[PDB]
Amino acid sequence: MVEDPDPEDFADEQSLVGRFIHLLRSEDPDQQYLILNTARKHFGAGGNQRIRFTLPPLVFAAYQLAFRYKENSKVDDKWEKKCQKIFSFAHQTISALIKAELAELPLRLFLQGALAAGEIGFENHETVAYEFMSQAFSLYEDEISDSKAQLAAITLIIGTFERMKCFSEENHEPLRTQCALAASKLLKKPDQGRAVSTCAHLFWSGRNTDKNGEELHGGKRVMECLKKALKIANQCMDPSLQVQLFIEILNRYIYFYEKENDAVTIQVLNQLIQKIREDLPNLESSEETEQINKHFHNTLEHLRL
Amino acid sequence: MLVLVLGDLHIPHRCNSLPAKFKKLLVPGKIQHILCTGNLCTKESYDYLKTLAGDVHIVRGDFDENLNYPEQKVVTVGQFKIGLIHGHQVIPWGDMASLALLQRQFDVDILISGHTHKFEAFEHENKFYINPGSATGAYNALETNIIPSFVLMDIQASTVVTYVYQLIGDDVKVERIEYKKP
């Protein structure tokens, strides 16, 4: 693309920063931090085109250094304070990418920061994690418009949040319902159905700190998500795409059934399989239609075994 | 027919290169197909795959620059219909039930996925699942000890021999797993 930059133009910058990080990983943590700050300043003077490539490695180096501090947790009594400084460094560095008018990358780097913070568990790590998630959601709302990019990002947000175990119920519930809302407000109906059903997982395998580290197991709220996704699937008009979504939602109902969600009944499974049996034969024969029949076939096979 | 299965290089986000001993083992001429789970992050790494074979299949990782790599792919090699996805779209990440649900949709004999950075191979409901791990042993927030790892599939006949290479300490260790389609 003539209008777009050629990546082969920043290959040397990339090679440099990789060679830099590899050699830095030899040095003592306390020095590593210093040299990262020095690196931030040196690479920061490249300008908006180059910082895209030279800065994300420094972000990842920082997360890594934080886990180093944690393994030295018995030797070094300041490790928590150094972690705090490190995520601060990460936040600033990512924020510079925003200033350079990027969104997709900084969003993902904030999610990575949230995960890391969640896992390390230094003093104040829940606040740091909440902040990082909040920043990702800001970039989601403000800067990502293309319907494809939205679906991608929201799945990544949900996926990231689903593995996190560091939030109290008072921080976990806002994030849950912010995910659910964004998912329901995607432009296209199919994308909406998918993202909403994807949200079901947050109410189930999501972990807050209130239950001693146990999953939420909110089977009721799971059903509500899938109920919403089904409503969205009826409003689809394209017959192939509608039957596709029915099958997808069914497999998701099965998933939670076999994970022993008591709110998923065999009635519900039966109503949805029956609906599919009816609608499925009314499709135009094609490669795509065989694939849909095969998917339903496979689902039914699994139900028996 | 031998297929190279690798991914999650993360060059240069998290690493600068493959391990020297892996570079050595990876030689042109012998590999027929490459199936890559994504997250190389740079075309430089793509060109490198092209030198090892002339049938490269790649899917889009969550940190890949190139928006022209497909989200998922079905490649049929010999008698095997192989699914290929990065795995950030499978939720919860790495979950087997979640992985199987996708098999039902793709209708594939083997399903390859990545993202976890943890090598894994296993059979479930008469289907085979492979995760080659990260060929560079890249950082990952959810696993502190990451072992550089990649996979070679050998097969011609309704049978699969997957050799898993892992860099343990400073030396390469191989493990052989056999799967046959029912």
Residue numbers in the entry:
A (entry chain C): 475 to 779
B (entry chain A): 1 to 182
Mind quoting what the paper says about this structure?
In this work we present the results of two X-ray diffraction experiments on crystals of the VPS35/VPS29 complex in presence of 2a. The VPS35sh construct was chosen since the complex obtained with the longer C-terminal portion of the VPS35 protein (M475-Leu796) produced crystals that diffracted only at low resolution (∼7 Å, not shown). For both crystals, the Fo-Fc difference Fourier maps showed traces of additional electron density, where it was possible to model two 2a molecules. The more stable portion of 2a is in close contact with residues Gln72, Leu101-Leu102 and Gln105 from VPS29, and Glu722 and Arg726 from VPS35. Such binding site seems to be incompatible with the stabilization of the VPS35/VPS29 interface, being mostly located on VPS35 and involving only transiently VPS29.
VPS35 (92 kDa) is the central protein component of the cargo selective trimer and is characterized by an elongated solenoid-like alpha helical structure that acts as a scaffold for the binding of VPS26 - at its N-terminal portion - and VPS29 at the C-terminal end.
